[PDB]
Amino acid sequence: APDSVDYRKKGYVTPVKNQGQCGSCWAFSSVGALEGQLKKKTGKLLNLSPQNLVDCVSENDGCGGGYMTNAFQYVQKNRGIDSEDAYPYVGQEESCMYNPTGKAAKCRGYREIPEGNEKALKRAVARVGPVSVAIDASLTSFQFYSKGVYYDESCNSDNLNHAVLAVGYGIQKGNKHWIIKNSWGENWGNKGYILMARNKNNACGIANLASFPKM
Numbered sequence: 669a670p671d672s673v674d675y676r677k678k679g680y681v682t683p684v685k686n687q688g689q690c691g692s693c694w695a696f697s698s699v700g701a702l703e704g705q706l707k708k709k710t711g712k713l714l715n716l717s718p719q720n721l722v723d724c725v726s727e728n729d730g731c732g733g734g735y736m737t738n739a740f741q742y743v744q745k746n747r748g749i750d751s752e753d754a755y756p757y758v759g760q761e762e763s764c765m766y767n768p769t770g771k772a773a774k775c776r777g778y779r780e781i782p783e784g785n786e787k788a789l790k791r792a793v794a795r796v797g798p799v800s801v802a803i804d805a806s807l808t809s810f811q812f813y814s815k816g817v818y819y820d821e822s823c824n825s826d827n828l829n830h831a832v833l834a835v836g837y838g839i840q841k842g843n844k845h846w847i848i849k850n851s852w853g854e855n856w857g858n859k860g861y862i863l864m865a866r867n868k869n870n871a872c873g874i875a876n877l878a879s880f881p882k883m
């Protein structure tokens with residue numbers, strides 16, 4: 669486990685997407701996680717379908733919200749997930765139309781990080797790859813972030829309200845951080861990314877609800 673790692677540099681990350689006016693962030697987090705592993709396992713990098721999840725995961729609420737663990741279990745039971753091309757994103761709830769022939773991957777379960785354990789989280793990102801996480805993205809300081817390691821005393825570790833993708837970690841000007849991939853488009857934050865404080869008392873609940881798919 670290095671002191672710094674960026675999976676974008678390793679080609680384990682697809683370009684930044686934009687969920688739009690739909691609470692499908694959980695879907696984008698799941699997908700991002702699957703894409704890392706799929707890349708790690710097969711050597712290819714393609715866009716998996718968040719819409720597949722939105723319409724098909726019955727234990728979740730589509731645009732009204734959901735959990736990544738539910739999304740992972742779905743892919744396992746369904747024995748697959750479609751590629752973005754085979755099931756494009758519409759940003760709206762629709763009936764499940766999973767196309768078996770557009771299948772791009774699947775998974776055989778998932779693994780959760782010990783709640784609140786930033787150490788294990790780092791270990792997971794180092795060992796396995798991009799990890800799905802939930803944070804508190806309610807603060808105005810988060811909405812308008814652009815540079816530097818983000819942090820705010822007002823952040824609530826118990827009000828988890830946004831699922832996001834941990835694609836790395838490092839240290840900038842003395843500050844350890846998490847390299848986070850958002851789904852609000854590229855013109856947001858730093859080209860769609862945000863570096864959030866690491867080892868700063870589990871800032872914004874970064875390690876409270878994290879997991880990764882297993883293939």
Ligand SMILES: *C(=O)([N][N]C(=O)[C]([C][C]([C])[C])[N]C(=O)O[C]C1=[C][C]=[C][C]=[C]1)[N][N]C(=O)[C]([C][C]([C])[C])[N]C(=O)O[C]C1=[C][C]=[C][C]=[C]1
Pocket residue numbers: 686687688689690691692693694727728729732733734735736802828829830831851852853856
């Ligand atoms: C996430 O999507 N978080 N919400 C957003 O990011 C919002 C959604 C609103 C529709 C506005 N912003 C947005 O969509 O805008 C994009 C944008 C913003 C600014 C500039 C440009 C573009 N949805 N939240 C969840 O899914 C949560 C998180 C989960 C990981 C804990 N889950 C949830 O609400 O629970 C649902 C549930 C599931 C199963 C059983 C019971 C409940």
